[PDB]
Amino acid sequence: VDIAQSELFRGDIQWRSFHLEASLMDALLNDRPEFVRLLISHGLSLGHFLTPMRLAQLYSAAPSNSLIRNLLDQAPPDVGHVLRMLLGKMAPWSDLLLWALLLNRAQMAMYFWEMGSNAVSSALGACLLLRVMARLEPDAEEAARRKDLAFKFEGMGVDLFGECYRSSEVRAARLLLRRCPLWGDATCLQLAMQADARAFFAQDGVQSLLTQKWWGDMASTTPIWALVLAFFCPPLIYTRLITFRRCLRRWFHFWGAPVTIFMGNVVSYLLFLLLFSRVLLVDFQPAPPGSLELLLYFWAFTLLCEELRQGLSGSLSQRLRLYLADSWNQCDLVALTCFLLGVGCRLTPGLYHLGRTVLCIDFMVFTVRLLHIFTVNKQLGPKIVIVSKMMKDVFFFLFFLGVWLVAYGVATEGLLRPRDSDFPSILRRVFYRPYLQIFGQIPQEDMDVALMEHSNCSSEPGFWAHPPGAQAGTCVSQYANWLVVLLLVIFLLVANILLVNLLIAMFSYTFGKVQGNSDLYWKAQRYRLIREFHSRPALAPPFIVISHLRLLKEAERKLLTWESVHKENFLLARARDKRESDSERLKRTSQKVDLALKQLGHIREYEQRLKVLER
Amino acid sequence: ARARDKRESDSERLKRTSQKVDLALKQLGHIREYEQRLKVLER
Amino acid sequence: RRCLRRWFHFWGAPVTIFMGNVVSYLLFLLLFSRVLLVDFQPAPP
Ligand SMILES: [Ca+2]
């Protein structure tokens, strides 16, 4: 391009818009980024240039049997349909940006986004489109390039918004994010959530906005103890303790805040568990259910209704699979399913014990759900995410332990030759007994012959000893008992020491490695938690039934200009820093010295002629 | 590509730009020596 | 033939050979344990 700009665009040649339209098409079709930037920069009217026929020609230039080419074949560009079934379907710069992203041209989309209008929205939208198409690309190498470009687009979206937030917190946080653009008629946060743009949620501006939405109409600096006191003392909200008709508006603001909904839900869930335990341990009888058991049945029924409302209103198949995609929602679904089985079996005349048994296991699932609380805390949310990533280490330890238990367990059983020889008992002595030896339960009197008396039990040849244990067998062989003791010594060394300490080292390495990513993941998923509690009914699950029964311009242009101004300021600063770098400075100073050498040589040539002429 | 990157490195660029300036100094000295003779001859 | 080629391709794949060997090895261990714990007697095998 330097040769073309220096020679053709030195200004001597008078150009025209039509003289460059053909060249502009060629640069676009042949992936020439610096040229299209140069051609447009030379006073070319893009708006009058682009035509639907030209746009159709641009999309016809998809490279051979490309992924994008397949979508047009399945789908007159008709790109609207291609956009709809990609996203989900639940200004020439924008069109050019879409074309570049579909064709996976980095610098084209790079340049087009810089000239776009809704830069923050487009950057997140570009990241979403690239990631979903990268997952859909079978090339397995172009997808890597798509993910790279998606990371780049997420990059400036963070950088541009960070600059916008620093200038005007009110303008950037409130209006720029919570707005519906033409991209998908969805807020920038929704685009980031769908794109899983974790780095976008990591910045302080997004986090500060989320906290304000989380706290509703109350000050984000309100202490936790102040909230709890107001929760248990409703009149306390009408004092100076909480900082925000007048009385009704304040009342609804406090009880409509997502944090108070979370706190109210948490207290209700704890009471439900307490009621569940009381019924299970005491009030559960073969007789027809009592008053408390009926209350528990009603309480669980509303919990089922609330979970149904979340899934139904969270495109019926599209939202249903979205609701089921959350692990916690899966935990809720299985807990309610077991509860239904327990109630059905309990009411059955001949299945009372089975009904109680499954309910006890069902209580375990409900109690485990309580871990969702720690996701709210800033210092505990990352910890839970790391715990989820430790499962790979746990599985390795379990598989290693399982092999060792089988090897040691069967050999010890084979050497002892207990005369019980019963399949339930054999399994106990092979798996159960060695397992407890890991945790300090070593029944030496059940394997060491020296600790048990000698007796005659069977007519089989050899010597036998009578263990005192109930499940240790009637009598065991004592042919080579030193080996059984030796195997116990080796088993304790491998299991109690080597394997356990190995897992600790594996946990320590994993915790340090995934610490950063988990923090990003928790920050990204923090928006999902806030959105879920934002639309939840204001009442507690026991009382949520009544809520369910009740349930059944110039400013925009000014904001966009303000965003666009900050974009050009950010770009100019980045370019200025690039030009002011040492490497660029070394590049420039080399050019000037070369120019000095050429001019010096001209002086030398001038010197000889002048001296010769003078003589 | 490896050789081009080596030549485009800052250290190599510093090496080259030092050579050209040294050439400029030698040519400048030639001009200075030419300057004295021409001025003397003119007088 | 097409059916035979597909059949041999599946059962000739190294991963399926590994999976088939793994299942066989587990069965061998299970048979080994059953003989050792129960069927092992001083009588002829
Ligand atoms: Ca839920």
Curated annotation (Swiss-Prot), chain B:
Residues 2-7 are annotated as: Mediates modulation by decavanadate and PIP2-binding. Widely expressed with a high expression in intestine and prostate. In brain, it is both expressed in whole cerebral arteries and isolated vascular smooth muscle cells. Prominently expressed in Purkinje fibers. Expressed at higher levels in T-helper 2 (Th2) cells as compared to T-helper 1 (Th1) cells. Expressed in keratocytes. The modification Phosphoserine is found at residues 11, 18. Changing residue 18 to A: Decreases the sensitivity to Ca(2+). Residues 1-43 form a coiled coil. Phosphorylation by PKC leads to increase the sensitivity to Ca(2+). Sumoylated. Desumoylated by SENP1. Signal peptide: none annotated. Calcium-activated selective cation channel that mediates membrane depolarization. While it is activated by increase in intracellular Ca(2+), it is impermeable to it. Mediates transport of monovalent cations (Na(+) > K(+) > Cs(+) > Li(+)), leading to depolarize the membrane. It thereby plays a central role in cadiomyocytes, neurons from entorhinal cortex, dorsal root and vomeronasal neurons, endocrine pancreas cells, kidney epithelial cells, cochlea hair cells etc. Homotetramer. It is linked to Progressive familial heart block 1B: A cardiac bundle branch disorder characterized by progressive alteration of cardiac conduction through the His-Purkinje system, with a pattern of a right bundle-branch block and/or left anterior hemiblock occurring individually or together. It leads to complete atrio-ventricular block causing syncope and sudden death. TRPM4, is a temperature-sensitive ion channel, it adopts distinct conformations at different temperatures, markedly influencing where and how ligands interact with it. Decavanadate (a positive modulator), ATP (an inhibitor) and Ca(2+) bind to different locations of TRPM4 at physiological temperatures or at lower temperatures. Belongs to the transient receptor (TC 1.A.4) family. LTrpC subfamily. TRPM4 sub-subfamily. This is Transient receptor potential cation channel subfamily M member 4. The gene is TRPM4. The chain holds residues 1135 to 1177 of 1214 of the full protein.
Curated annotation (Swiss-Prot), chain C:
The chain crosses the membrane at residues 18-38. Residues 39-45 are extracellular. Phosphorylation by PKC leads to increase the sensitivity to Ca(2+). Widely expressed with a high expression in intestine and prostate. In brain, it is both expressed in whole cerebral arteries and isolated vascular smooth muscle cells. Prominently expressed in Purkinje fibers. Expressed at higher levels in T-helper 2 (Th2) cells as compared to T-helper 1 (Th1) cells. Expressed in keratocytes. Belongs to the transient receptor (TC 1.A.4) family. LTrpC subfamily. TRPM4 sub-subfamily. Homotetramer. It is linked to Progressive familial heart block 1B: A cardiac bundle branch disorder characterized by progressive alteration of cardiac conduction through the His-Purkinje system, with a pattern of a right bundle-branch block and/or left anterior hemiblock occurring individually or together. It leads to complete atrio-ventricular block causing syncope and sudden death. TRPM4, is a temperature-sensitive ion channel, it adopts distinct conformations at different temperatures, markedly influencing where and how ligands interact with it. Decavanadate (a positive modulator), ATP (an inhibitor) and Ca(2+) bind to different locations of TRPM4 at physiological temperatures or at lower temperatures. Calcium-activated selective cation channel that mediates membrane depolarization. While it is activated by increase in intracellular Ca(2+), it is impermeable to it. Mediates transport of monovalent cations (Na(+) > K(+) > Cs(+) > Li(+)), leading to depolarize the membrane. It thereby plays a central role in cadiomyocytes, neurons from entorhinal cortex, dorsal root and vomeronasal neurons, endocrine pancreas cells, kidney epithelial cells, cochlea hair cells etc. This is Transient receptor potential cation channel subfamily M member 4.
